[PDB]
Amino acid sequence: MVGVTAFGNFDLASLAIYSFWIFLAGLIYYLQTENMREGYPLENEDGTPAANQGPFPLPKPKTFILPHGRGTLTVPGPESEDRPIALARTAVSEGFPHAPTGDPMKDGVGPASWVARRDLPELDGHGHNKIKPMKAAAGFYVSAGKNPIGLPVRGCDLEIAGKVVDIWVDIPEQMARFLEVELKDGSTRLLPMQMVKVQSNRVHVNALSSDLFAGIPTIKSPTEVTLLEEDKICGYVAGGLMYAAPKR
Amino acid sequence: ALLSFERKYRVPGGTLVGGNLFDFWVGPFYVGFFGVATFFFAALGIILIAWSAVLQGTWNPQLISVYPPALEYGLGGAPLAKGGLWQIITICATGAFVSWALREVEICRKLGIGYHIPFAFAFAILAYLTLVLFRPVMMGAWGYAFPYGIWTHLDWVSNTGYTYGNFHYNPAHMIAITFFFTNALALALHGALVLSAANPEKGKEMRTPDHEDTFFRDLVGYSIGTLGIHRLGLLLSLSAVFFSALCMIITGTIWFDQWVDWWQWWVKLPWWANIPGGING
Amino acid sequence: LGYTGLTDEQAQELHSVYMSGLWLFSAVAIVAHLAVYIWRPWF
Amino acid sequence: SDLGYTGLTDEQAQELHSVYMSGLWLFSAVAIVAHLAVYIWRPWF
Amino acid sequence: LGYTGLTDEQAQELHSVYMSGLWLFSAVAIVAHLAVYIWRPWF
Amino acid sequence: LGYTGLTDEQAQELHSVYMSGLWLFSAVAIVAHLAVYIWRPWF
Amino acid sequence: LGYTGLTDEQAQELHSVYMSGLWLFSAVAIVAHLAVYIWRPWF
Amino acid sequence: MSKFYKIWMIFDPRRVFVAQGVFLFLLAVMIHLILLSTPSYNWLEISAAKYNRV
Amino acid sequence: MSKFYKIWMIFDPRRVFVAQGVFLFLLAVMIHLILLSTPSYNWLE
Amino acid sequence: MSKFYKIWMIFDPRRVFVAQGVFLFLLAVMIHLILLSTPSYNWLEISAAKYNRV
Amino acid sequence: MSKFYKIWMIFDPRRVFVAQGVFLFLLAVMIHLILLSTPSYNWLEISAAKYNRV
Amino acid sequence: MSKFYKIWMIFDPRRVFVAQGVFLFLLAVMIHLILLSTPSYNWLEISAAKYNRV
Amino acid sequence: MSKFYKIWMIFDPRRVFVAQGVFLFLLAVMIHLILLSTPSYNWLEISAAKYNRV
Amino acid sequence: AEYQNIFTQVQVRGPADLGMTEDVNLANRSGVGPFSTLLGWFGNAQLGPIYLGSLGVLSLFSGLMWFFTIGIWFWYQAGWNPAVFLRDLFFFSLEPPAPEYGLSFAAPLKEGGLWLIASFFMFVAVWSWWGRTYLRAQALGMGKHTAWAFLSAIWLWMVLGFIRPILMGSWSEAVPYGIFSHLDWTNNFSLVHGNLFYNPFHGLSIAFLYGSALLFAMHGATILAVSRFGGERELEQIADRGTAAERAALFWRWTMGFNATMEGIHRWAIWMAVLVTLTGGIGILLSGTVVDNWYVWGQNHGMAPL
């Protein structure tokens, strides 16, 4: 039985607890610095570097090697929003909202914002397209639930906006990703599965009204979707929650 | 002041109450109406705890304790020096937690994301309320609720558990513990798997989720998936807290004996209740 | 300088009003403290 | 660069510091008044 | 190498101001130490 | 060599000024140790 | 074997300076051990 | 005190007013509760004792 | 009290009235409960 | 000493003012609470013992 | 010795100053608390002893 | 001996300096606390005993 | 043993230096605390007994 | 009324995914098992394939021997009575040898030897499974984070069953193999060492178990809330930050004042989880070997009134 104290009340338990406080301080520093590889250095609302950068310095850069010859990403690195953000500030001082200049859902700001991702399709471990339509997906079929092929699609304004013609599937994860909806104009749109509500007789889309499925961004190739395209589509649909409220 | 991508998201709207009066940011924080409510409640509670430290006569943060009123005060107020400070800190904390969840709802609405986070926090708040409000109300005294001290709410846990013997034998307690342990295991596995895919051995290309699925199918023959793992983590945490609240709501109100005796119903089933041998027989 | 966007005359006027409110508050506080002091002195 | 992380110039910084020092001296003088008052009422030394 | 991006003269000026602040702080500290020690020495 | 991207001249200057700071610290430490060992020796 | 990339010549001077530090450290350690053993031996 | 008005060229009133209201109400509640906690200045209990209401 | 009208140049009344009503009602409830807590004014025995 | 104004060429006045306002308020409330803790300097306690109001 | 300006070629002044402010305040508070916990150097208690304030 | 400057060819001066500062502060605080925890060397208590403070 | 320098061919010097430094410091404090634990080597208490400090 | 993304509403099945053959001996990998629609409502519907190498079969057979040894002891305790076996299943216990045997291996089978046999089997099974996790990570070229995260839990397990019994000088200190039995052991361990609540490392371990629950709720809820932007595909968000990662970061930035990245949140996760068992093992190692009454230690270290 140890328990001899070297001084005061400082036995081995005290040594251990103070050692753990030191280790925890170091670990929290390490975790916080490792979580500053994106979004830094901090910027003023005009995009210039801010005077206050915080107690934690930025970490040393590290490079990820992308898996299909897609390149190399070094973080933290230079950061620039490669798109024309259409907002104007509502106050000269900091910490106030920036109002849209025009149509926010169309311009892609606020809840409708999208990020200028790489304009290439997501590639699985075999280098093929990860997300592809069920038609091109060999041997892929609906296993459970109501198969939503030909179900009318209802918007938040409670009117039919089109019919589902296909399901886009993530091949390795073997899960549904997008519904392809053909509108009244004969053109096609993609809708994320997370924002549709498949039901007994119809696919409900609470995010968008009927007169908004035309505004959904399209895919240049009809049998594939790139990261940028799906980012734009998902941003549009999600922004419909705030910006289609006036309709419903 | 802002992240490099933050500006295109700081648009007006999404506010539950107000809309311009409290629709702005202080530093990084979004200040809604519920932001003001939360800040006031938190500051009042913290300075009241400091005041109770002054009253108690100790400046040790570990020794500071704010006991609820004694049992003879019932469900009524008490002098600030005796039991009233606890009740004020309790209403302050309840308001702070609820307004924090509502502020989260406002932030979710502004960002156009789901409301999962405030819902989970609501589970946590409901467990807290079970411990401070619902159970003491059903037992008719604020004195059953735990004190607000670092090492004295542990004494509350100890005394409350030992009132019923070994508290391990509460079956809902067993289920909640299973969920808690499973959740910690799953969190370790998820962090490890994502980090191992994103940090391959040495100068190797970053791994795809196919490699994650392959790793876990190789290991245990199943892979719940990238979406399934986050569903599982959320459900494990929420079920853990739900069964914690359930186990405490039935203790002292539906069950009053030693919890171990509750298991006798299995050993007394008539077909085998009187077979000699084993442990109970 | 020049953060909030208010000009010098606007700041002057706003601060004059704000100091008026501060002094109204302080005078009512003085009357309250005088009443308490004549009722129960703390010194 | 020490030529200003905040973007202020020497004149703006000097004037802002003058007003801040005036406020600090006001606060410190009121504090000295309070300290002398309490010490005469009940000294700690 | 120089990581802060300062110039040598900017570092000189910043150091002079900082050392002035440090010497003022240490002077007030020395005054406090002398006062306490003559009042109640610890040696 | 060539791990922090420093050259011999700046590394030498940095080392010299660091050694100067270290010797200042050590001299003050030795003064404190002499004072204590005079006041209450531990050997 | 570019395991570290050192050119087989940097490693020489690196080892020499590290050995200098090691010998200084061990020499002070030996002096300390002699002093404590003289003060009261542990054998 | 002449140039203190320039504080309103540093801070937007829409945030300083919210901060000031929160602060003053909080300080008021803290002081009132501190007085009510000590029996010496608990006005309700002083009144209960004076008027033999216990 | 003359110039205090400029306060509506700063804050939108359509929200300020709601916020102030919430505040005053909660202050009322706090005072009611505080008098309840002391035994010499609890009117709900 | 004369060049201390350059502190504002390194630190943003809004951040500094908020920080030192919170710091001074917390320091003052902590010192007052420390005094209220000590019996020899709790002004309320000294007053109540001065006028036999217990 | 006088050539210690070059630290500012190395360390960012803003982080150094905020860290030093925190360090100085915490060191001062710790030393004041060490004295307050010592009966022979608690100034408030020494005053209470010399002026019979108990 | 004289070649030790190569330490700055391997390790970033910023990391070394901050690590050394933290280490020295913690070591000094620990040693002062050890000496303050032994009545043989607690200079506060020693000076209390020297002048009959208690 | 002459060719021992080739160890830096395989081992990264930064890792070895940091690991060895932390290991030596931890070993040193462990031995100092072991000595402080044994009253036969607590130099503080040895001096206390020798000079009748307590 | 809105889809919360808790259960998939349409399941899709394609050809069986055999996985990535980085360095995996395809001989050891079994065939793809069945597809479970019940499991598919929540995650992947596919079962298997499972890899079975040297360490896999070693661990599987060693664990089978451990489980079978405990079960046969339980059957013996039931008097070979299936009704008694079902009635007292949770009450049976394979107990370690009595304290008078110390660490010796000369205890009778009924009084501790069978516990030693089962303990050896469990030791082999767990360490072979650890090596198996390391090797499966290595075969796919991934990092070894799973192995070290497992090593933390292995350290708590080793302290409980192996290291602390050796330090305390007897196998009787270790944990019995039984459902209610090891709960009784836990409660008695707390009682003997004087309210383990006052063990600082028990307190930290609980802090981190609560923190793991908090953090996995936060992370799962955050990813589900941004799954409408493909947020659950976290690796691509690490490689090419989309609007899901930005919205998650900004949610927690505007709520807490600070945030994580898609990659660093998993560092938070792994450390929060491993600290549970790391701190817990330290505390259990200290209990008895250094401190035998944690309440008195608490009192002497603040934490409790004298």
Ligand code: BCL
């Ligand atoms: C009356 C009981 C005592 C008490 C006595 C103890 C004792 C004794 C211990 C704890 C420990 C802990 N206590 Mg406690 N504890 C009490 C009250 C609490 C309360 C509460 C609110 O009251 C909580 C939340 C906790 C929580 C905790 C955890 C933080 C900690 C357990 C960590 C863990 O995950 O181990 C679970 C994980 C493991 C044991 C490791 C598992 C890894 C191995 C390798 C698994 C292999 C599986 C095996 C081979 C079988 C395979 C199965 C098949 C493959 C399917 N205690 C009271 C005061 N507590 C433990 C601790 O960490 O101490 C500080 C511990 O030893």
Ligand SMILES: CC[C@H]1c2cc3[nH]c4c(c3C)C(=O)[C@H](C(=O)OC)c4c3nc(cc4[nH]c(cc(n2)[C@@H]1C)c(C(C)=O)c4C)[C@@H](C)[C@@H]3CCC(=O)OC/C=C(\C)CCC[C@H](C)CCC[C@H](C)CCCC(C)C
């Ligand atoms: C339901 C699953 C788990 C969970 C989930 C969860 N917790 C959450 C969230 C979620 C999803 C948030 O979004 C929210 C958050 O913002 O996280 C960073 C939060 C949060 N969970 C927190 C803590 C927390 N969660 C816990 C538990 C859990 N949280 C569950 C296990 C615990 C435990 C088990 O002890 C703690 C300590 C906070 C970090 C944060 C909520 C912050 C908040 O409410 O802010 C407003 C309030 C304050 C700033 C403080 C108010 C202080 C009072 C006025 C005075 C003190 C009162 C208190 C009762 C004293 C206690 C004394 C002693 C008991 C110590």
Ligand SMILES: CC[C@H]1c2cc3[nH]c4c(c3C)C(=O)[C@H](C(=O)OC)c4c3nc(cc4[nH]c(cc(n2)[C@@H]1C)c(C(C)=O)c4C)[C@@H](C)[C@@H]3CCC(=O)OC/C=C(\C)CCC[C@H](C)CCC[C@H](C)CCCC(C)C
């Ligand atoms: C960071 C700490 C947390 C943690 C982490 C953690 N655990 C881990 C890991 C990690 C990181 C792994 O990598 C490893 C793993 O593989 O996870 C899936 C593991 C693991 N943690 C496990 C359990 C576990 N972890 C726990 C706790 C925790 N784990 C902590 C909370 C607990 C608790 C709370 O008690 C348990 C019970 C396992 C799932 C696994 C280690 C598996 C192992 O060692 O297996 C050995 C096998 C046996 C001893 C049992 C054999 C049983 C059978 C008889 C085998 C034969 C079966 C037969 C062949 C079937 C035939 C079928 C056909 C007939 C159809």
Ligand SMILES: COC(C)(C)C/C=C/C(C)=C/C=C/C(C)=C/C=C/C(C)=C/C=C/C=C(C)/C=C/C=C(\C)CC/C=C(\C)CCC=C(C)C
């Ligand atoms: C438990 O152990 C105890 C506590 C008992 C004993 C242990 C004690 C220990 C370990 C003590 C350690 C003490 C130390 C290391 C103290 C260090 C103190 C220092 C370094 C204080 C420095 C103070 C410096 C100050 C106050 C400088 C202020 C400067 C200004 C206010 C001016 C700033 C403005 C500038 C620089 C503008 C310039 C800008 C341009 C662009 C030129």
Ligand SMILES: COC(C)(C)C/C=C/C(C)=C/C=C/C(C)=C/C=C/C(C)=C/C=C/C=C(C)/C=C/C=C(\C)CC/C=C(\C)CCC=C(C)C
């Ligand atoms: C439980 O055991 C106990 C604690 C009782 C006993 C154990 C004791 C132990 C283990 C003690 C260990 C002690 C050690 C290892 C102490 C080492 C102390 C050292 C190495 C201190 C070094 C201090 C160095 C200082 C203060 C250097 C300061 C340097 C400067 C200020 C120079 C500034 C740098 C500049 C200007 C670089 C800019 C130049 C250019 C060209 C940019």
Ligand SMILES: COC(C)(C)C/C=C/C(C)=C/C=C/C(C)=C/C=C/C(C)=C/C=C/C=C(C)/C=C/C=C(\C)CC/C=C(\C)CCC=C(C)C
């Ligand atoms: C529990 O068991 C107990 C503790 C009771 C007994 C067990 C004791 C044990 C197991 C002791 C183990 C002792 C061992 C293995 C000690 C190993 C010592 C070694 C390897 C020492 C080597 C040291 C090298 C040193 C200290 C180098 C020092 C350098 C300086 C002091 C000057 C700084 C210059 C450097 C670092 C080189 C600069 C040049 C460049 C290019 C960086």
Ligand SMILES: COC(C)(C)C/C=C/C(C)=C/C=C/C(C)=C/C=C/C(C)=C/C=C/C=C(C)/C=C/C=C(\C)CC/C=C(\C)CCC=C(C)C
């Ligand atoms: C536990 O230990 C105890 C507490 C017992 C003892 C320990 C005590 C300690 C450690 C105390 C430490 C005290 C310290 C460091 C106090 C420092 C106080 C300072 C630096 C106060 C400074 C105050 C400055 C003030 C109040 C200035 C106010 C200025 C104004 C109100 C004017 C507004 C400013 C404007 C308008 C700027 C000009 C704007 C333009 C556009 C030109």
Ligand SMILES: COC(C)(C)C/C=C/C(C)=C/C=C/C(C)=C/C=C/C(C)=C/C=C\C=C(C)\C=C\C=C(/C)CC/C=C(\C)CCC=C(C)C
């Ligand atoms: C019909 O049923 C049949 C018979 C077919 C199968 C049924 C089986 C049954 C009923 C199995 C029941 C199993 C149970 C109840 C298992 C419970 C296990 C529990 C709760 C274990 C809990 C903790 C165990 C720990 C902490 C073990 C730690 C062990 C170590 C750390 C390694 C120990 C190694 C030692 C002591 C040294 C061994 C080495 C030698 C050379 C003896």
Ligand SMILES: CCCCCCCCCCCCO[C@@H]1O[C@H](CO)[C@@H](O[C@H]2O[C@H](CO)[C@@H](O)[C@H](O)[C@H]2O)[C@H](O)[C@H]1O
């Ligand atoms: C929080 C992390 C930072 C911790 C401080 C940095 C140094 C790390 C090592 C510190 C180790 C010594 O830490 C110090 O140990 C002594 C041992 O009696 C403790 O003990 C001292 O204070 C306590 C509490 O008043 C007394 O009951 C005790 O008699 C007295 O000796 C100190 O309270 C503690 O501060």
Ligand SMILES: [Fe+3]
């Ligand atoms: Fe994740």
